[PDB]
Amino acid sequence: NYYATLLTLLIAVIVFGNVLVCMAVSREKALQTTTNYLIVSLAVADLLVATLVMPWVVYLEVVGEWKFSRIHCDIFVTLDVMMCTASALNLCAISIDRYTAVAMPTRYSSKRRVTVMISIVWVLSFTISCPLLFGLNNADQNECIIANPAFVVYSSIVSFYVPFIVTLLVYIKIYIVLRRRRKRNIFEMLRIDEGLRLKIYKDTEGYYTIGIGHLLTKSPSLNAAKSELDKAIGRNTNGVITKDEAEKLFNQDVDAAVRGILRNAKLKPVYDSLDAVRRAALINMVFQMGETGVAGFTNSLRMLQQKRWDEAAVNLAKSRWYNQTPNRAKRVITTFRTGTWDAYQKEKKATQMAAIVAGVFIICWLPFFITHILNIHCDCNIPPVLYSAFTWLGYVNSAVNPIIYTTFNIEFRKAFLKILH
Ligand SMILES: O=C(CCCN1CCC(O)(c2ccc(Cl)cc2)CC1)c1ccc(F)cc1
Ligand SMILES: CCCCCCCC/C=C\CCCCCCCC(=O)O
Ligand SMILES: CCCCCCCC/C=C\CCCCCCCC(=O)O
Ligand SMILES: CCCCCCCC/C=C\CCCCCCCC(=O)O
Ligand SMILES: CCCCCCCC/C=C\CCCCCCCC(=O)O
DSSP, rough: OOOOHHHHHHHHHHHHHHHHHHHHHOGGGGGHHHHHHHHHHHHHHHHIIIIIIIHHHHHHHHHHOSSSOOOHHHHHHHHHHHHHHHEEEEEHHHHHHHHHHOOOOOHHHHHHHHHHHHHHHHHHHHHHHHHHHHHTTTTTSSSSSGHHHHHHHHHHIIIIIHHHHHHHHHHHHHHHHHHHHHHHHHHHHHHHOOOOOOEEEEOSSSSSEEEEEEEESSSSSSSHHHHHHHHHHHSSTTTBHHHHHHHHHHHHHHHHHHHHHTTTTTHHHHHHHHHHHHHHHHHHHHHHOOOOTSSSSSSHHHHHTTOOOOHHHHHHHHHHHHHHHHHHHHHHHHHHHOOSSSOOOOOHHHHHHHHHHHHHHHHHHHHHHHHHHHHHTTTTTOHHHHHHHHHHHHHHHHHHHHHHHHHHHHHHHHHHHHHHO
């Protein structure tokens, strides 16, 4: 009916979005990065689906059954599985290239490496698909490989779940790595402002503290003050701590500071509103003056919530807080405006996009392999009317990816507008 015309334009927008991505990467040196090279390899898998495969899927909707040779169906199924597996194996290499960038310290060596990855993606995609042409070691095929009971079991495990687990395990490791550095930079930030002390010392208000504003005990008794420290370290403090031990002590101070921020009605919303780095600045304030003290200049706090970065910085400089510790105030206020650690970077934003495509990829195809589980779980025969929608939802992912590139990235965005105009 009229539904055939929607899909052919879906094929057209898949080609529209991806042909842009390929040229845009090779057009500008600023987008010629390891990850973006792996991204065009993903774009080529999304193009070959739209050109080699999706046309036969639309005829199958139009006509309503195969109505072509058995071997044509084998080729069509083999190639359909092959290009979707390239899509998955490309996400896997993208995540791995994101692991290396955040976790490892690279000119000609990057091009020679990415090359090796891309070569693995397609060769393996192919070698995984070759069984479908030779009837999954089942001779007298006598039928399109789709009809083999093992087909859904082979294609689901080998081409989806197993690449899905690995890519997910990498992203977890990436999250852990970024989490250690984010906590590393906080400690490093307050080491610069408060100062790191490794011998027990009387603080401003008289009580004995150590490291970065960690009071051992409100009660002043030196041997008793050692006492609380000894509980913390486990070794005989003897009033002596390592940088490391202080940091371990520091991350505890941060975690306590944060629960109080969320338990504070004046600071819960604004903390929730801010980004990771800007949150480290707000932590710096609570460390310096206390949540009740930071909870003041609500007037200034509204601006940080309203994303008014420039106007919050103008209003913060007006304070007494600036007058007492101007250098520290200016440093922190930059981090509030800049939202970066320049006062005291590139790949954390880029790695957020990588996971974002790997996530919408999964949600786009997830229901398709869900339904296939239900039939294998012998559940009430799943209506085909839905079964077809889930196929296209999976194929829709080919058109969403170039939309995500331009959405969450300025460089693809600018490279795109240059080609059109
Ligand atoms: O493999 C797939 C999804 C099935 C594609 N493909 C849809 C059409 C199909 O359902 C079909 C139906 C009827 C006929 Cl006749 C031929 C083919 C065969 C399977 C895949 C998806 C995501 C991924 F990360 C890895 C692999
Ligand atoms: C081919 C399918 C691959 C499936 C991959 C699934 C990935 C899901 C997304 C993210 C979960 C882990 C967090 C990723 C790190 C993000 C960095 C950060 O914001 O700290
Ligand atoms: C079935 C899941 C397997 C996932 C594989 C996905 C493809 C990309 C992954 C790995 C290739 C890594 C090659 C790196 C070579 C480095 C050589 C060098 O340092 O020059
Ligand atoms: C089932 C998953 C198996 C593969 C895991 C994928 C993640 C990491 C992949 C491989 C490790 C890459 C190491 C490259 C070694 C090159 C050494 C060299 O030549 O200097
Ligand atoms: C058994 C499941 C396997 C899961 C492995 C994936 C989890 C680890 C995360 C990423 C590994 C990336 C390694 C890339 C390093 C390249 C340099 C080198 O290997 O010498």
